[PDB]
Design a protein around this ligand. Structure first.
Ligand SMILES: COc1ccc(C[C@H](N)C(=O)N[C@H]2[C@@H](O)[C@H](n3cnc4c(N(C)C)ncnc43)O[C@@H]2CO)cc1
Length: 232
């Protein structure tokens, strides 16, 4: 049971054979090369592990997910946004966002130099993207993830100013839906993400969605770096 990946192949074991507790633990080892990483997202698997541990790959059951249209926005958040003090941009500073998440210290601590360089390559190659939230000239939050057709896999987010990451997601969902976005993978569910409207569906359901959506498509220029929302 369980399995060590080899530097030779880039193949992964079927997600369904993953462990029950720790939920999702499927395999360890391998590397974080673009090819293997990309392969993992294709198969509905993601790497996650603390510093000093060998690479760990997961595919939990259920799976956290967020339907873009079901994003919950408090009435005070709408009030806030209507007169928002933030500027949201896309792919303006991926390196700064991932670094921001990597400092969140509650658990951005798993984002080691190696993981950071790993998703940097995916960003250069055009698979990973980031949404930045600015307060005047300072980056006060954001989120990044691996795009996959009409599905988007959230990796992490951070906030240095009140409601920052909320608007990051708010603005993202609008843009996302408006252009054919269909689902947001939230990996593992937690309090913040759950209050935002995230929910859990069966691993096999998420996997199906994955297969139907990875084939989808968004405008050929959806991810080019641009501003999505400007303050007043
Ligand atoms: C569309 O825009 C976005 C962008 C980013 C996200 C990240 C989302 N907060 C999220 O998945 N937040 C999660 C994950 O990034 C990551 N994580 C993932 N798996 C685990 C795990 N195990 C499998 C044991 N243990 C601990 N942490 C894990 O930790 C965070 C909270 O615990 C969501 C949407």
């Amino acid at each position: 049971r369980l399995v060590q990946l080899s530097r030779h192949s880039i193949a992964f074991p079927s997600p369904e054979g993953a462990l029950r507790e720790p939920n999702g633990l499927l395999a360890l080892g391998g590397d974080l090369s673009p090819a293997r990483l990309l392969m993992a997202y294709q198969r509905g698997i993601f790497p996650w592990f603390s510093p000093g541990d060998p690479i760990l790959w997961w595919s939990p059951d259920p799976r956290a997910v967020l339907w873009p249209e079901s994003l919950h926005i408090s009435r005070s958040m709408k009030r806030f946004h209507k007169r928002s003090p933030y500027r949201v941009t896309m792919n303006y500073a991926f390196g700064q966002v991932i670094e921001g998440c990597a400092s969140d210290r509650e658990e951005g601590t798993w984002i080691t130099r190696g993981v950071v360089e790993a998703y940097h390559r995916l960003h250069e190659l055009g698979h990973a993207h980031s949404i930045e939230v600015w307060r005047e000239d300072e980056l006060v939050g954001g989120m990044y993830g691996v795009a996959q057709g009409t599905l988007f896999c959230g990796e992490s987010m951070f906030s240095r100013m009140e409601n920052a990451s909320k608007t990051a997601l708010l603005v993202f969902c609008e843009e996302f839906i408006g252009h054919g976005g269909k689902l947001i993978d939230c990996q593992v569910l937690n309090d913040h993400t759950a209050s935002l409207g995230a929910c859990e569906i069966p691993r096999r359901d998420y996997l199906n969605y994955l297969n139907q959506m990875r084939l989808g498509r968004l405008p050929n220029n959806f991810w080019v770096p641009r501003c999505l929302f400007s303050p007043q």
